[PDB]
mmCIF file of C-alpha atoms in Angstrom:
data_model
loop_
_atom_site.group_PDB
_atom_site.id
_atom_site.type_symbol
_atom_site.label_atom_id
_atom_site.label_comp_id
_atom_site.label_asym_id
_atom_site.label_seq_id
_atom_site.Cartn_x
_atom_site.Cartn_y
_atom_site.Cartn_z
ATOM 1 C CA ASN M 5 30.949 162.245 214.219
ATOM 2 C CA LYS M 6 32.864 163.770 217.136
ATOM 3 C CA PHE M 7 36.124 162.438 215.650
ATOM 4 C CA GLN M 8 35.108 163.017 211.997
ATOM 5 C CA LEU M 9 34.915 159.219 211.385
ATOM 6 C CA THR M 10 32.414 156.990 209.511
ATOM 7 C CA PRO M 11 31.728 153.240 209.353
ATOM 8 C CA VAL M 12 33.970 153.154 206.272
ATOM 9 C CA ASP M 13 36.930 154.097 208.454
ATOM 10 C CA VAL M 14 35.935 151.523 211.066
ATOM 11 C CA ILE M 15 35.774 148.779 208.412
ATOM 12 C CA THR M 16 39.099 149.827 206.873
ATOM 13 C CA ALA M 17 40.834 149.810 210.291
ATOM 14 C CA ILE M 18 39.444 146.372 211.204
ATOM 15 C CA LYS M 19 40.588 144.912 207.919
ATOM 16 C CA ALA M 20 44.044 146.399 208.432
ATOM 17 C CA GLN M 21 44.482 145.698 212.157
ATOM 18 C CA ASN M 22 42.717 142.298 212.434
ATOM 19 C CA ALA M 23 44.763 140.627 209.777
ATOM 20 C CA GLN M 24 46.819 137.473 209.307
ATOM 21 C CA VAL M 25 49.941 138.262 207.271
ATOM 22 C CA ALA M 26 52.196 135.926 205.281
ATOM 23 C CA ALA M 27 55.737 137.190 205.846
ATOM 24 C CA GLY M 28 58.136 134.501 204.597
ATOM 25 C CA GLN M 29 61.168 133.240 206.510
ATOM 26 C CA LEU M 30 64.585 134.138 207.782
ATOM 27 C CA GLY M 31 66.930 132.033 205.695
ATOM 28 C CA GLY M 32 64.059 131.257 203.326
ATOM 29 C CA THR M 33 64.596 129.518 200.038
ATOM 30 C CA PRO M 34 66.346 129.948 197.697
ATOM 31 C CA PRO M 35 68.974 130.883 200.369
ATOM 32 C CA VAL M 36 72.414 132.456 200.355
ATOM 33 C CA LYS M 37 75.351 130.016 200.621
ATOM 34 C CA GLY M 38 76.410 129.441 204.232
ATOM 35 C CA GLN M 39 73.085 130.408 205.760
ATOM 36 C CA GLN M 40 72.858 128.969 209.239
ATOM 37 C CA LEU M 41 69.454 130.142 210.467
ATOM 38 C CA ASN M 42 65.977 129.309 209.162
ATOM 39 C CA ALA M 43 62.906 130.595 211.020
ATOM 40 C CA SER M 44 59.337 131.575 210.131
ATOM 41 C CA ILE M 45 58.615 135.310 210.255
ATOM 42 C CA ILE M 46 55.419 135.928 212.243
ATOM 43 C CA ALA M 47 53.861 139.351 211.574
ATOM 44 C CA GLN M 48 50.262 140.452 212.364
ATOM 45 C CA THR M 49 47.920 137.606 213.479
ATOM 46 C CA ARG M 50 44.143 137.641 213.850
ATOM 47 C CA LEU M 51 42.787 139.244 217.000
ATOM 48 C CA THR M 52 41.302 136.973 219.599
ATOM 49 C CA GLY Z 24 44.064 141.870 140.516
ATOM 50 C CA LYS Z 25 43.314 139.803 143.586
ATOM 51 C CA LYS Z 26 44.920 136.567 142.353
ATOM 52 C CA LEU Z 27 48.324 138.269 142.416
ATOM 53 C CA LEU Z 28 48.041 139.370 146.055
ATOM 54 C CA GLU Z 29 47.218 135.921 147.460
ATOM 55 C CA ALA Z 30 49.673 134.300 145.050
ATOM 56 C CA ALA Z 31 52.405 136.565 146.422
ATOM 57 C CA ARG Z 32 51.171 135.936 149.982
ATOM 58 C CA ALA Z 33 51.223 132.169 149.417
ATOM 59 C CA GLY Z 34 54.661 132.277 147.792
ATOM 60 C CA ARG Z 35 53.598 130.625 144.533
ATOM 61 C CA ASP Z 36 56.169 131.676 141.937
ATOM 62 C CA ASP Z 37 55.075 130.477 138.490
ATOM 63 C CA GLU Z 38 51.582 131.678 139.315
ATOM 64 C CA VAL Z 39 52.907 135.210 139.878
ATOM 65 C CA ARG Z 40 54.915 134.980 136.641
ATOM 66 C CA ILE Z 41 51.806 133.798 134.778
ATOM 67 C CA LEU Z 42 49.830 136.719 136.237
ATOM 68 C CA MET Z 43 52.139 139.465 134.994
ATOM 69 C CA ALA Z 44 52.514 137.320 131.865
ATOM 70 C CA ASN Z 45 48.709 137.574 131.789
ATOM 71 C CA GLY Z 46 48.722 141.245 132.858
ATOM 72 C CA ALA Z 47 48.170 141.367 136.641
ATOM 73 C CA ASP Z 48 48.706 144.821 138.210
ATOM 74 C CA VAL Z 49 51.935 144.508 140.234
ATOM 75 C CA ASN Z 50 50.788 147.590 142.228
ATOM 76 C CA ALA Z 51 47.412 146.072 143.208
ATOM 77 C CA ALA Z 52 46.690 146.861 146.877
ATOM 78 C CA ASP Z 53 44.419 144.956 149.293
ATOM 79 C CA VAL Z 54 42.064 146.669 151.744
ATOM 80 C CA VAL Z 55 44.911 147.723 154.070
ATOM 81 C CA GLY Z 56 47.012 148.945 151.139
ATOM 82 C CA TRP Z 57 49.408 146.019 151.024
ATOM 83 C CA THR Z 58 50.825 145.192 147.592
ATOM 84 C CA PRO Z 59 52.252 141.861 146.493
ATOM 85 C CA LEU Z 60 55.668 143.316 147.286
ATOM 86 C CA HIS Z 61 54.499 144.182 150.812
ATOM 87 C CA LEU Z 62 53.245 140.604 151.227
ATOM 88 C CA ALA Z 63 56.382 139.054 149.752
ATOM 89 C CA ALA Z 64 58.665 141.207 151.913
ATOM 90 C CA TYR Z 65 56.521 140.451 154.976
ATOM 91 C CA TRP Z 66 56.531 136.676 154.658
ATOM 92 C CA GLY Z 67 60.098 136.668 153.308
ATOM 93 C CA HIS Z 68 59.721 135.418 149.694
ATOM 94 C CA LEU Z 69 62.954 136.852 148.290
ATOM 95 C CA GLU Z 70 62.550 135.487 144.739
ATOM 96 C CA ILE Z 71 59.029 136.891 144.460
ATOM 97 C CA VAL Z 72 60.359 140.336 145.458
ATOM 98 C CA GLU Z 73 62.866 140.165 142.601
ATOM 99 C CA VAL Z 74 60.209 139.148 140.072
ATOM 100 C CA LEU Z 75 57.761 141.957 140.984
ATOM 101 C CA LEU Z 76 60.565 144.505 141.026
ATOM 102 C CA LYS Z 77 61.724 143.116 137.682
ATOM 103 C CA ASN Z 78 58.123 143.751 136.538
ATOM 104 C CA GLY Z 79 57.774 147.361 137.667
ATOM 105 C CA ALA Z 80 56.343 146.917 141.161
ATOM 106 C CA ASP Z 81 56.546 150.232 143.056
ATOM 107 C CA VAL Z 82 59.422 149.613 145.462
ATOM 108 C CA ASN Z 83 58.117 152.466 147.697
ATOM 109 C CA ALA Z 84 54.422 151.598 147.832
ATOM 110 C CA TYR Z 85 52.964 152.435 151.217
ATOM 111 C CA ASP Z 86 49.992 150.971 153.036
ATOM 112 C CA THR Z 87 47.227 152.889 154.747
ATOM 113 C CA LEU Z 88 49.484 153.549 157.754
ATOM 114 C CA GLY Z 89 52.433 154.709 155.651
ATOM 115 C CA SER Z 90 54.567 151.590 155.879
ATOM 116 C CA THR Z 91 56.673 150.325 152.936
ATOM 117 C CA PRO Z 92 58.023 146.879 151.951
ATOM 118 C CA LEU Z 93 61.429 147.874 153.328
ATOM 119 C CA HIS Z 94 59.857 148.498 156.752
ATOM 120 C CA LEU Z 95 58.387 144.973 156.793
ATOM 121 C CA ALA Z 96 61.624 143.355 155.649
ATOM 122 C CA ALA Z 97 63.826 145.343 158.039
ATOM 123 C CA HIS Z 98 61.494 144.664 160.935
ATOM 124 C CA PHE Z 99 61.422 140.904 160.508
ATOM 125 C CA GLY Z 100 65.058 140.223 159.686
ATOM 126 C CA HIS Z 101 64.907 139.411 155.955
ATOM 127 C CA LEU Z 102 68.432 140.620 155.234
ATOM 128 C CA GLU Z 103 68.680 139.591 151.579
ATOM 129 C CA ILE Z 104 65.304 141.152 150.763
ATOM 130 C CA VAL Z 105 66.436 144.364 152.477
ATOM 131 C CA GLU Z 106 69.491 144.351 150.176
ATOM 132 C CA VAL Z 107 67.395 143.632 147.068
ATOM 133 C CA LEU Z 108 64.872 146.364 147.850
ATOM 134 C CA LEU Z 109 67.687 148.809 148.519
ATOM 135 C CA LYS Z 110 69.438 148.015 145.209
ATOM 136 C CA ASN Z 111 66.118 148.643 143.464
ATOM 137 C CA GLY Z 112 65.594 152.143 144.836
ATOM 138 C CA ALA Z 113 63.925 151.473 148.215
ATOM 139 C CA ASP Z 114 63.771 154.755 150.151
ATOM 140 C CA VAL Z 115 66.074 153.924 153.086
ATOM 141 C CA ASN Z 116 64.570 156.751 155.216
ATOM 142 C CA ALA Z 117 60.861 156.296 154.504
ATOM 143 C CA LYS Z 118 58.709 157.184 157.547
ATOM 144 C CA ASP Z 119 55.375 155.553 158.306
ATOM 145 C CA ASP Z 120 52.517 157.556 159.891
ATOM 146 C CA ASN Z 121 54.251 157.206 163.300
ATOM 147 C CA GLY Z 122 57.542 158.632 162.155
ATOM 148 C CA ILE Z 123 59.084 155.154 162.240
ATOM 149 C CA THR Z 124 61.874 154.283 159.782
ATOM 150 C CA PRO Z 125 63.312 150.922 158.685
ATOM 151 C CA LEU Z 126 66.316 151.677 160.870
ATOM 152 C CA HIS Z 127 64.055 152.017 163.949
ATOM 153 C CA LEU Z 128 62.340 148.703 163.195
ATOM 154 C CA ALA Z 129 65.545 146.802 162.484
ATOM 155 C CA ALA Z 130 67.101 148.294 165.616
ATOM 156 C CA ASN Z 131 64.092 147.312 167.700
ATOM 157 C CA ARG Z 132 64.558 143.623 166.833
ATOM 158 C CA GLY Z 133 68.354 143.619 167.079
ATOM 159 C CA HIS Z 134 69.024 142.779 163.413
ATOM 160 C CA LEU Z 135 72.597 144.070 163.436
ATOM 161 C CA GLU Z 136 73.301 143.167 159.804
ATOM 162 C CA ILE Z 137 70.223 144.948 158.437
ATOM 163 C CA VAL Z 138 71.164 148.005 160.513
ATOM 164 C CA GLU Z 139 74.618 148.075 158.907
ATOM 165 C CA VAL Z 140 73.163 147.627 155.411
ATOM 166 C CA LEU Z 141 70.643 150.411 155.991
ATOM 167 C CA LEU Z 142 73.421 152.673 157.286
ATOM 168 C CA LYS Z 143 75.647 151.849 154.288
ATOM 169 C CA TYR Z 144 72.721 152.964 152.130
ATOM 170 C CA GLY Z 145 72.403 156.269 153.959
ATOM 171 C CA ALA Z 146 69.922 155.656 156.758
ATOM 172 C CA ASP Z 147 69.568 158.851 158.797
ATOM 173 C CA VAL Z 148 70.859 157.691 162.168
ATOM 174 C CA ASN Z 149 69.317 160.733 163.882
ATOM 175 C CA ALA Z 150 65.797 160.356 162.406
ATOM 176 C CA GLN Z 151 63.228 160.649 165.223
ATOM 177 C CA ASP Z 152 59.819 159.001 165.443
ATOM 178 C CA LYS Z 153 56.718 160.806 166.742
ATOM 179 C CA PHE Z 154 58.018 160.392 170.308
ATOM 180 C CA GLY Z 155 61.442 161.882 169.680
ATOM 181 C CA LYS Z 156 63.191 158.494 169.775
ATOM 182 C CA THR Z 157 66.092 157.466 167.515
ATOM 183 C CA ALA Z 158 67.479 154.028 166.761
ATOM 184 C CA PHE Z 159 70.150 154.792 169.367
ATOM 185 C CA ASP Z 160 67.459 155.422 172.002
ATOM 186 C CA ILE Z 161 65.890 152.101 171.055
ATOM 187 C CA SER Z 162 69.170 150.256 171.503
ATOM 188 C CA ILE Z 163 69.744 151.830 174.916
ATOM 189 C CA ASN Z 164 66.256 150.977 176.104
ATOM 190 C CA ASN Z 165 66.671 147.433 174.852
ATOM 191 C CA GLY Z 166 70.074 147.058 176.514
ATOM 192 C CA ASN Z 167 71.601 145.904 173.224
ATOM 193 C CA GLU Z 168 75.247 146.915 173.710
ATOM 194 C CA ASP Z 169 76.327 145.573 170.306
ATOM 195 C CA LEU Z 170 73.787 147.704 168.439
ATOM 196 C CA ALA Z 171 74.276 150.730 170.695
ATOM 197 C CA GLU Z 172 77.874 150.767 169.481
ATOM 198 C CA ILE Z 173 77.283 150.683 165.691
ATOM 199 C CA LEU Z 174 74.808 153.539 166.067
ATOM 200 C CA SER R 27 61.158 137.114 177.974
ATOM 201 C CA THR R 28 63.444 138.394 180.700
ATOM 202 C CA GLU R 29 64.528 141.201 178.342
ATOM 203 C CA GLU R 30 60.945 142.487 178.049
ATOM 204 C CA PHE R 31 60.341 142.342 181.803
ATOM 205 C CA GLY R 32 63.653 144.201 182.293
ATOM 206 C CA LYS R 33 62.465 147.171 180.252
ATOM 207 C CA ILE R 34 59.273 147.649 182.248
ATOM 208 C CA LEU R 35 59.201 151.404 182.982
ATOM 209 C CA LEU R 36 58.811 152.049 186.698
ATOM 210 C CA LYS R 37 59.431 155.782 186.872
ATOM 211 C CA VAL R 38 60.480 158.764 184.774
ATOM 212 C CA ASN R 39 62.814 160.874 186.940
ATOM 213 C CA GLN R 40 62.732 164.671 187.353
ATOM 214 C CA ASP R 41 65.579 165.121 184.868
ATOM 215 C CA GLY R 42 63.606 162.986 182.365
ATOM 216 C CA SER R 43 65.705 159.869 183.010
ATOM 217 C CA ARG R 44 64.093 156.443 183.191
ATOM 218 C CA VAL R 45 63.936 153.871 186.002
ATOM 219 C CA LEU R 46 63.497 150.396 184.459
ATOM 220 C CA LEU R 47 62.714 147.140 186.240
ATOM 221 C CA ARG R 48 66.195 145.823 185.439
ATOM 222 C CA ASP R 49 67.581 148.833 187.418
ATOM 223 C CA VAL R 50 66.075 147.530 190.694
ATOM 224 C CA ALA R 51 65.909 143.740 190.150
ATOM 225 C CA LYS R 52 67.608 140.707 188.691
ATOM 226 C CA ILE R 53 65.335 138.896 186.240
ATOM 227 C CA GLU R 54 65.504 135.229 185.310
ATOM 228 C CA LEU R 55 63.430 132.157 184.524
ATOM 229 C CA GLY R 56 63.352 130.123 187.744
ATOM 230 C CA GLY R 57 61.115 127.805 189.746
ATOM 231 C CA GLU R 58 57.764 128.665 191.345
ATOM 232 C CA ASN R 59 59.277 127.684 194.631
ATOM 233 C CA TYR R 60 62.545 126.502 196.031
ATOM 234 C CA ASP R 61 61.646 124.519 199.117
ATOM 235 C CA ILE R 62 62.604 121.117 197.609
ATOM 236 C CA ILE R 63 66.013 120.167 196.214
ATOM 237 C CA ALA R 64 65.823 116.923 194.249
ATOM 238 C CA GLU R 65 68.855 114.840 193.330
ATOM 239 C CA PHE R 66 69.323 111.526 191.580
ATOM 240 C CA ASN R 67 72.706 110.012 192.484
ATOM 241 C CA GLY R 68 73.810 113.561 193.444
ATOM 242 C CA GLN R 69 72.767 115.171 190.143
ATOM 243 C CA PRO R 70 69.912 117.700 189.659
ATOM 244 C CA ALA R 71 66.662 115.959 188.841
ATOM 245 C CA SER R 72 62.994 116.365 188.165
ATOM 246 C CA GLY R 73 60.542 113.565 187.542
ATOM 247 C CA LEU R 74 56.991 112.250 187.752
ATOM 248 C CA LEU A 12 67.912 117.564 211.504
ATOM 249 C CA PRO A 13 67.349 119.750 214.610
ATOM 250 C CA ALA A 14 65.043 122.761 214.851
ATOM 251 C CA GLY A 15 65.976 125.661 212.624
ATOM 252 C CA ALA A 16 68.410 123.659 210.524
ATOM 253 C CA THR A 17 68.831 124.946 206.983
ATOM 254 C CA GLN A 18 68.512 123.367 203.550
ATOM 255 C CA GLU A 19 72.292 123.486 202.964
ATOM 256 C CA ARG A 20 72.957 121.524 206.172
ATOM 257 C CA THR A 21 70.357 118.911 205.252
ATOM 258 C CA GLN A 22 71.928 118.641 201.825
ATOM 259 C CA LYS A 23 75.319 117.666 203.294
ATOM 260 C CA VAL A 24 73.709 114.876 205.291
ATOM 261 C CA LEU A 25 71.839 113.668 202.237
ATOM 262 C CA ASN A 26 75.065 113.812 200.228
ATOM 263 C CA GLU A 27 76.707 111.535 202.826
ATOM 264 C CA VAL A 28 73.754 109.132 202.756
ATOM 265 C CA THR A 29 73.972 109.037 198.934
ATOM 266 C CA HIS A 30 77.719 108.480 199.003
ATOM 267 C CA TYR A 31 77.425 105.626 201.498
ATOM 268 C CA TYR A 32 74.903 103.680 199.392
ATOM 269 C CA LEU A 33 76.839 104.182 196.157
ATOM 270 C CA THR A 34 80.156 103.042 197.693
ATOM 271 C CA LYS A 35 79.590 100.755 200.714
ATOM 272 C CA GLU A 36 76.651 99.165 198.800
ATOM 273 C CA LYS A 37 77.982 99.614 195.255
ATOM 274 C CA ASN A 38 77.074 96.026 194.459
ATOM 275 C CA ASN A 39 73.409 96.201 195.583
ATOM 276 C CA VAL A 40 72.290 99.807 194.942
ATOM 277 C CA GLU A 41 71.428 101.190 191.536
ATOM 278 C CA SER A 42 70.310 104.717 192.510
ATOM 279 C CA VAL A 43 69.512 107.126 195.335
ATOM 280 C CA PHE A 44 66.705 109.647 194.735
ATOM 281 C CA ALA A 45 67.235 112.269 197.410
ATOM 282 C CA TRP A 46 64.607 114.865 198.259
ATOM 283 C CA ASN A 47 65.703 117.743 200.455
ATOM 284 C CA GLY A 48 62.757 119.562 202.065
ATOM 285 C CA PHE A 49 60.158 116.935 202.780
ATOM 286 C CA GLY A 50 60.090 113.947 205.025
ATOM 287 C CA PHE A 51 57.585 111.617 206.517
ATOM 288 C CA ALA A 52 57.232 113.641 209.736
ATOM 289 C CA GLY A 53 56.466 116.786 207.737
ATOM 290 C CA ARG A 54 58.114 119.302 205.475
ATOM 291 C CA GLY A 55 60.844 121.817 206.005
ATOM 292 C CA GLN A 56 64.451 122.678 205.414
ATOM 293 C CA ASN A 57 65.522 120.255 208.170
ATOM 294 C CA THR A 58 63.803 117.200 206.596
ATOM 295 C CA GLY A 59 64.719 114.898 203.757
#
């Protein structure tokens, strides 16, 4: 209450900030001709 | 009355001839106000169209939403039937309840030839439907560069 | 069809102009994914 | 191929493998069915 928050906000923040995101790849398919680099993009991962 | 409508829907010629030869109302309308000419134009039975027009079928009959046989034929690309209807007095600028004209419908499908025929017969190129749209607007929205020119 | 997807209306601008999907994207029939290139004697192939 | 190698680079190796079998073994080989993107160690742009 002191910060004008509720459990809804807590739940929303946990779902947004403890998240495992699929983010594709550098040089992912179908690629541009002459691409030299292919790497997974790693974005948010679950908290531990 | 009803035998004519389904005969014209089925595309069964001699039947239709026997039914005016036996006195069937050429202007008989089903529950949505479609006449044998509507049905023949819709499905594309050119010869049937000629026979009902030869027999006094209202070329400008409209259904319960204001649409005429020319609308149906323009919409679905039946070029020869568009020509026939037009030679028999089809109102080239008839509007349905939405403001939509045969030119709008033919434009919306890309039937370039029908569009030229309708124009040759005096289609109002600036006629607007209930949303303010003309056949030109339709061609732009569709990306049809060929049609957008003619209009 | 690609033509119908292209005329999806994204936005109507202030001046009344229209933003369509084909104004922000190329639109084509393609594969569901592009991770595997298959060739039979160097020619494009599918199979079973 | 090594870590990070791209689909296009794998394809050139596969094209050389194909070409070898259909020339140096023209008398024994009827076809080469080349898959770029999966292998027996796993999947990926550097496998075929």
